Design a protein around this ligand. Sequence first.
Ligand SMILES: NCCCCCC(=O)NCCCCCC(=O)O
Ligand SMILES: NCCCCCC(=O)NCCCCCC(=O)O
Lengths: 384, 384
Amino acid sequence: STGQHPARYPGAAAGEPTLDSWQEPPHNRWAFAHLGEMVPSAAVSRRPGHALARLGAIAAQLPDLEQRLEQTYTDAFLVLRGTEVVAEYYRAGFAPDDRHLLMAVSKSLCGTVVGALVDEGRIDPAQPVTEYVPELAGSVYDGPSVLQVLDMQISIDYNEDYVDPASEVQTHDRSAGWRTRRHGDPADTYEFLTTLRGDGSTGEFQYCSANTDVLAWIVERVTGLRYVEALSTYLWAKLDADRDATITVDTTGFGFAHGGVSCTARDLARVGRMMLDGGVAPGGRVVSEDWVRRVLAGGSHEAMTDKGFTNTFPDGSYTRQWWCTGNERGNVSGIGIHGQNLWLDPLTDSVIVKLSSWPDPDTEHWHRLQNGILLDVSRALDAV
Amino acid sequence: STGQHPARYPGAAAGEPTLDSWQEPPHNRWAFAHLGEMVPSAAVSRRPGHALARLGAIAAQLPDLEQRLEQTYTDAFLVLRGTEVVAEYYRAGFAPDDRHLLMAVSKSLCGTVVGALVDEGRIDPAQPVTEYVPELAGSVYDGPSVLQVLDMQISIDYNEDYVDPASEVQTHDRSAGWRTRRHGDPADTYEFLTTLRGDGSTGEFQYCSANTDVLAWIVERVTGLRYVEALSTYLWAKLDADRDATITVDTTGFGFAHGGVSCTARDLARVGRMMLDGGVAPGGRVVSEDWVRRVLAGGSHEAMTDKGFTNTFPDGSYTRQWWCTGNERGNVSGIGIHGQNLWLDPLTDSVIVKLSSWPDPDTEHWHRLQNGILLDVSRALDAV
Ligand SMILES: NCCCCCC(=O)NCCCCCC(=O)O
Ligand SMILES: NCCCCCC(=O)NCCCCCC(=O)O
């Protein structure tokens, strides 16, 4: 068993409603107001064709920028310098206020929610995961600290290969509803997480999407809130965002914390703005000054043995669900597959959002092109 | 085979993407911007507990109105007199701008889209269904006219019982994704519709949710648009609505035309306002003056043999996806199970929206209470 989880609505039994019960009372009062949480749904537009390019301020220094964005399958691109939007691009068919899947940029949002609860003293990163989720006893998460989950420094038998049909990634997807279930698959994300094992070693970076969903589970046990609601209460509702974000949910209503958030480019930039403002957003403080400082400082370099990342960023590292380049600019970024970045450039007090749809999830080729763009744009923002 | 359907996105193969392919190219460019269409998803609120009652203008004549609304499981209630909102109620936990499932009030919206295409001369109600959907040859829809579909005057072997697990209603739900699929179930709504049979007789009213989805299929074949888009282009985008509506979609992306729309109470009222304005909305004419006049006029009374409806409304009838009371006020209404009404009161130039969640889909008890409220409120709007 996976223990207590936040009810889908006040008074709801465990796991209720399901696809087969949502039309029945008492579930239907909630379900009729939230049907998209149960059944795939399309927007019927209240508004009655070509790319929008407003690169302007940086166009002079990067003349071929629009072409470079096209070549990296860019859907939305936005540069926020200070509080000002100084450059924007949206592909044909994607409106400025359309939402876009963040993939693992979602992880950086989850880490922020954890940080908020650390600031409140409700989570101690030094404590073992099992202090908050006892039901993870007997799994690979039995022993490691919350900080080791945050920093992805737990050795886990989990093949994070996004194209291999046999990988734990796909089983993770099937358990959560991103792919069609197979017979024998775990019923939900919580159950899947408890099946994970490892050799017990810690301290070396291993990127594993399961870690973030464990963080979200901790958030739920500490707050009593559905992760969906915690993500709003501790982060999204303080941003003065233009639109709600969305997050996919599994059959229990658990948000897909490691990859399932969608939002507008402009609103995602507000998360970066909060980070460069020492953790404060328009609606109040989100995380502590110290938390932000530790993110910008980076993780242990020696833990970072991912040759892929360090080939580009030799002094790079990872901490608290952020990638840290360790480059001369101190760039830090949320990253999601197929070309999602929430990229911070503290030197120029700027945030770069790039949301894309590369044909491939993760190759050296696409990252070389993408990082070239983000670095060039960052440098174009320097005083001259 | 069910023939040509509108692609989910430009250039998409038939049936693409599926839950298992949406992360792959070329699907992922579309899917990353529309993930809610593929995977159940929750809103993450951008906004940081008790019922809102603003009945006022009619409160004096109906002192116990709020209690009566509570007793009928009212979630949202709104009265539009002319262009003015003169009364509103929202239960605790439901915000004024929250969306609510319409159930079969959705049918009246679909009929409106059909009406728009009739006004354009792209649909002739006198023509057989098979003029537009040849693939329905061999089914119960082989022979009947489009108007007979619109008026629900086709005898069909289809048990429209919402609680019986053996009914065609539930098979319809399973085919479309409202309930969990069983082995052997049709793959999508189109396939399900082609399995329907009847004795061949027409002319008598038989309420059948399949009829509306056949209408939506016709809309798609005539326009080349996904029903989701047609519902926007021909109706929703002309309303000057506050919010998008939503509609659930099946695995091909086909909107659940007969019951799956959700919208705000205020925006639903704009549909009623359009009907009482002779078919014109802020964004342009939606349907012809003649179409609206025929809706208000009613269908054939002799076709209406539903003892349930006629017990309350002896001179009642049904036409073009609207229920016509035939009462002394000429009231007409969209109706959906569990207490949804888009109720028109032409005498007072008023629209009443009531969106509810009765524990039961359809009983004499709930309809007696609900109709009592709608009639009392209508009469309270009369000059005195
Ligand atoms: N389970 C569905 C996919 C989950 C999202 C995975 C994701 O977005 N991963 C990002 C990996 C970034 C790697 C960056 C690098 O190595 O340089
Ligand atoms: N397939 C899922 C449910 C489809 C919605 C059915 C629905 O809303 N039906 C309305 C029936 C109204 C009957 C009114 C009366 O008889 O007075």
